[PDB]
Design a protein around this ligand. Structure first.
Ligand code: HEM
Ligand code: HEM
Ligand code: HEM
Ligand code: HEM
Lengths: 141, 146, 141, 146
């Protein structure tokens, strides 16, 4: 569960992302494909080459879903239900992969926000991404 | 895989009483039923909307016997599950786009099917050797992913 | 999330455990310690030998808690609050361990209730154990 | 672990620029902060009630230096992580009773510490190589558990 400071911490860190969300989302993705090659099994229909616009296009989507969850930090289950339905019933992504992407996102953020990526902030972002992943896998069965 | 000879001796001996047909049919069926997202690879198998739809589906079954059949053979190569499954590794990666995690899931359903079927005979120690087996298989199958 | 069928299915299976929960709980622990030796890092103070009394005794504790879980299937959080506190603040067992034990309990059950451990009952207990596990690790951070 | 030579060249190149004293204190401290349950092994370390209590604690800082100092030496032996960490594997198992999962947690926190520190310099491919390294260490450290 996200505490007042967790929320404050994610509103702030994500606030700084501001503009680069999509750009960062795409990087997170690239980081995941490379470090956790098994993740590529869900994107067989994609161009997974450095700078593919498929990846850029998808990174943006991911980043906006995150931006939306942040904006509805207080109602995440409802904010992302369509996305849960989707992952639960169409994509059917093994829950394990949420943890891998979330890690890549943390890496990505750490890499771009040296100043804001504090132990406290790191901690809050980690719980944040975990609840997002939780929300997204809640309807799997 | 590092198996003791008492470990291997015990694996071997129970494996000897497996009806691969129905045990593979049972294992794969349960997978589809317990972890429904694993069904994403089998839309072409037909109706999987119910545990019976799944359990009694002939594709599941035959696919089960096929999978379990290949399991059986690695048992003959407990010392080289790696090279035993190299081609199947590339195929599952390169062609079927199977998340290797599914392999872990299967191994655990298997272990559960064996227990169910052997009851009392599938002892803490027999389970422990088997756990080593299905983990080695999952890893051997996950081997050529890139 | 437990559906009415799931709950009905857990009460059924669990009811048949009846008097052996203690016995099954200790067997589950024994299978885990052998199958997943890393789980032993948490009971350095237990004699872990076969038929050890600590194990036997602990098996009953766990069993009983599961029984209370089954009884309060609709209010687990509250039924298990003290236990969550315990695991989150004192014990601090790494969350990944909840999965090894759950599995061990599934095998235990399969091996003792042939006729009742149906694909459907199997699916249900699995979901059950998963939610118990979630409840126990819900207050970790 | 099986690193490319451009991979091992990459690992090594960057590692040359890290301050082990302060990166060790930083990765250990961050572990205790983000996965507070990991604090279970450090009651004798004193106040860990807050991120600053943790991060500025001299025992936390001094322990991080040792873990990383140790990590840094496995780096010279990428081809023999297991023998490198064999005695430390036994110490952690047999005497400290540390769940190996802690090793993986730290690896990840380490990866995030590197990123934070190297910024742009910790590229997708640089990370992928370190992911390989931290995974090998966790496994090497877990090797002797029984
Ligand atoms: C917190 C993590 C995640 C978020 C926020 C997220 C969000 C999204 C969104 C917004 C979409 C597109 C939906 C649309 O088209 O409207 C999507 C699609 C998809 N996601 Fe997820 N997802 C996450 C995790 C994952 C993971 C871990 C994987 C696999 C490793 C994955 C695999 C997919 C795939 C295969 C698609 C279909 C995309 C396409 O064909 O363009 N997702 N996700
Ligand atoms: C766990 C060990 C497994 C083994 C040894 C195994 C073995 C096999 C074998 C021997 C084939 C036959 C391929 C051919 O030559 O045409 C096959 C096909 C296949 N398996 Fe795997 N399998 C395993 C697990 C899984 C799992 C867990 C899944 C997914 C949940 C899966 C999905 C498939 C699919 C989709 C095919 C292709 C089916 C077709 O030919 O229509 N397998 N498997
Ligand atoms: C189904 C999940 C679990 C349940 C229902 C459960 C239940 C319990 C109960 C009822 C107690 C006793 C507290 C008391 O003395 O009143 C306990 C303690 C304990 N549990 Fe958990 N537990 C679970 C998972 C785990 C796991 C996975 C581990 C680690 C491998 C673990 C390690 C411990 C330890 C070390 C103790 C204290 C032992 C002692 O001092 O005798 N538990 N648990
Ligand atoms: C990840 C790789 C790791 C390495 C290379 C490493 C290395 C070391 C070394 C060199 C020592 C001192 C040995 C001695 O005193 O003889 C030590 C002690 C210790 N380690 Fe590890 N460590 C690692 C991970 C961890 C983790 C993840 C934890 C738990 C969160 C941990 C918990 C401990 C504890 C509690 C001590 C004893 C400190 C004391 O004297 O109170 N270690 N470690």
């Amino acid at each position: 569960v996200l505490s007042p400071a967790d929320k404050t911490n994610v509103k702030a860190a994500w606030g700084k992302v501001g503009a680069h969300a999509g750009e960062y989302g795409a990087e997170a993705l690239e980081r995941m494909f490379l470090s956790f090659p098994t993740t590529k099994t869900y994107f067989p229909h994609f161009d997974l080459s450095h700078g593919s616009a498929q990846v850029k296009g998808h990174g943006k989507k991911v980043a906006d879903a995150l931006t939306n969850a942040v904006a509805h930090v207080d109602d995440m289950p409802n904010a992302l239900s369509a996305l849960s339905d989707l992952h639960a019933h169409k994509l059917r992504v093994d829950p394990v992969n949420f943890k891998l992407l979330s890690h890549c996102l943390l890496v990505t953020l750490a890499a771009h926000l040296p100043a804001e990526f504090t132990p406290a902030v790191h901690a809050s972002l980690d719980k944040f991404l975990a609840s997002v992943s939780t929300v997204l896998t809640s309807k799997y069965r | 895989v590092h198996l003791t000879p008492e470990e291997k001796s015990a694996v071997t001996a129970l494996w000897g009483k497996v009806n691969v047909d129905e045990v593979g049919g049972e294992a794969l069926g349960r997978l589809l039923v317990v972890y429904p997202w694993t069904q994403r690879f089998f839309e072409s198998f037909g109706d999987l909307s119910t545990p019976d739809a799944v359990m009694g589906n002939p594709k599941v079954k035959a696919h089960g016997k096929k999978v379990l059949g290949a399991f059986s053979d690695g048992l003959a190569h407990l010392d080289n599950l790696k090279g035993t499954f190299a081609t199947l590794s590339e195929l599952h990666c390169d062609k079927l786009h199977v998340d290797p995690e599914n392999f872990r899931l299967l191994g655990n359903v298997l272990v559960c099917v064996l227990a169910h079927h052997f009851g009392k005979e599938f002892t803490p120690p027999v389970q422990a050797a088997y756990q080593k087996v299905v983990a080695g298989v999952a890893n051997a199958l996950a081997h050529k992913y890139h």
